Amino acid sequence: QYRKELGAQLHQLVLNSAREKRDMEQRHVLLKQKELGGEEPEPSLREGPGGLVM
Amino acid sequence: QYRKELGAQLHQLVLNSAREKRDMEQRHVLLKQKELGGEEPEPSLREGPGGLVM
């Protein structure tokens, strides 16, 4: 009884995960193709606690 | 004089190409992410010369 109760929760969790990670895959192949930058990281100048943070 | 003349056609051909392999690359990651199927190849039963071809 514990075994079928758990298993049936388990099937939904790994189906949920298969959908979840396949969407991540659809965004990553999309990032790589369209938004993948070649330049170095760039610091960001802003206002902050007792003057500007960078 | 031959060098610089040829070099102008040479660069344009590889600018043309540099686009070219970017289009193949651009379709191939669209194909790979979204339409890439795991089922086995299936023949096509279509009429040909002499009767049915598959």
Coordinates of C-alpha atoms in Angstrom, one line a residue:
Chain A
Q1 CA 0.0 0.0 0.0
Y2 CA 2.8 2.5 0.7
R3 CA 4.6 1.2 -2.5
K4 CA 1.6 2.1 -4.9
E5 CA 0.8 5.3 -3.0
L6 CA 4.4 6.5 -3.4
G7 CA 4.8 5.2 -6.9
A8 CA 1.9 7.0 -8.2
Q9 CA 3.3 10.3 -6.7
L10 CA 6.7 9.4 -8.2
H11 CA 5.3 9.0 -11.8
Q12 CA 3.9 12.6 -11.6
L13 CA 7.1 14.0 -10.2
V14 CA 9.4 12.6 -13.1
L15 CA 6.7 13.6 -15.7
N16 CA 6.6 17.1 -14.2
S17 CA 10.5 17.0 -14.4
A18 CA 10.5 15.8 -18.1
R19 CA 8.3 18.8 -19.1
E20 CA 10.3 21.1 -17.0
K21 CA 13.6 20.2 -18.2
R22 CA 12.6 19.9 -21.9
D23 CA 11.4 23.6 -21.7
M24 CA 14.8 24.5 -20.2
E25 CA 16.3 22.7 -23.2
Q26 CA 14.0 24.8 -25.6
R27 CA 15.2 28.0 -23.9
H28 CA 18.9 27.0 -23.9
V29 CA 19.0 26.0 -27.7
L30 CA 17.2 29.4 -28.2
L31 CA 19.8 31.3 -26.0
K32 CA 22.7 29.7 -27.7
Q33 CA 21.4 30.6 -31.2
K34 CA 20.0 34.2 -30.5
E35 CA 21.2 35.7 -27.3
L36 CA 24.7 34.2 -26.6
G37 CA 27.1 37.1 -26.1
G38 CA 30.8 37.0 -27.2
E39 CA 32.0 40.1 -25.2
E40 CA 33.6 39.9 -21.6
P41 CA 31.3 40.5 -18.5
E42 CA 30.7 44.3 -17.8
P43 CA 30.4 46.0 -14.4
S44 CA 27.4 48.0 -13.6
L45 CA 27.5 51.6 -12.1
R46 CA 24.6 52.5 -9.7
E47 CA 23.6 54.4 -6.6
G48 CA 24.0 52.4 -3.3
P49 CA 24.6 52.5 0.5
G50 CA 26.7 55.7 1.2
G51 CA 27.5 56.2 -2.4
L52 CA 27.8 54.4 -5.8
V53 CA 28.4 50.6 -6.2
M54 CA 30.4 48.9 -8.9
Chain B
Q1 CA 47.5 44.7 -58.5
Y2 CA 46.3 41.0 -59.1
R3 CA 46.5 40.4 -55.4
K4 CA 44.3 43.3 -54.3
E5 CA 41.7 42.5 -57.2
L6 CA 41.5 38.9 -56.3
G7 CA 41.5 39.7 -52.6
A8 CA 38.3 41.8 -53.2
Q9 CA 36.5 38.9 -54.9
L10 CA 38.1 36.4 -52.2
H11 CA 36.8 38.3 -49.2
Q12 CA 33.3 38.7 -50.7
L13 CA 33.1 34.9 -51.4
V14 CA 34.0 34.1 -47.8
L15 CA 31.6 36.9 -46.5
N16 CA 28.9 35.0 -48.6
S17 CA 30.0 31.8 -47.1
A18 CA 30.2 33.0 -43.5
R19 CA 26.4 33.8 -43.9
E20 CA 26.0 30.5 -45.8
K21 CA 27.2 28.2 -42.9
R22 CA 25.3 30.4 -40.4
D23 CA 22.0 29.6 -42.2
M24 CA 22.7 25.8 -42.2
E25 CA 23.7 26.2 -38.5
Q26 CA 20.5 28.2 -37.8
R27 CA 18.2 25.7 -39.4
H28 CA 20.1 22.6 -37.8
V29 CA 19.6 23.9 -34.2
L30 CA 15.9 24.6 -35.1
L31 CA 15.7 21.0 -36.4
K32 CA 17.6 19.5 -33.5
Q33 CA 15.5 21.1 -30.6
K34 CA 12.0 21.1 -31.9
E35 CA 11.4 18.5 -34.7
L36 CA 14.1 15.9 -34.1
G37 CA 12.2 12.5 -33.9
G38 CA 13.3 9.1 -32.4
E39 CA 11.0 6.7 -34.3
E40 CA 12.6 4.5 -36.9
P41 CA 12.6 5.6 -40.7
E42 CA 9.6 4.5 -42.5
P43 CA 9.4 3.7 -46.3
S44 CA 6.8 5.2 -48.7
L45 CA 4.5 3.1 -50.7
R46 CA 4.0 5.3 -53.8
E47 CA 3.3 4.2 -57.4
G48 CA 6.4 4.3 -59.7
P49 CA 7.2 3.0 -63.1
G50 CA 6.1 -0.6 -63.4
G51 CA 3.7 -0.6 -60.4
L52 CA 4.3 -0.1 -56.7
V53 CA 7.6 1.2 -55.4
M54 CA 8.7 1.1 -51.7

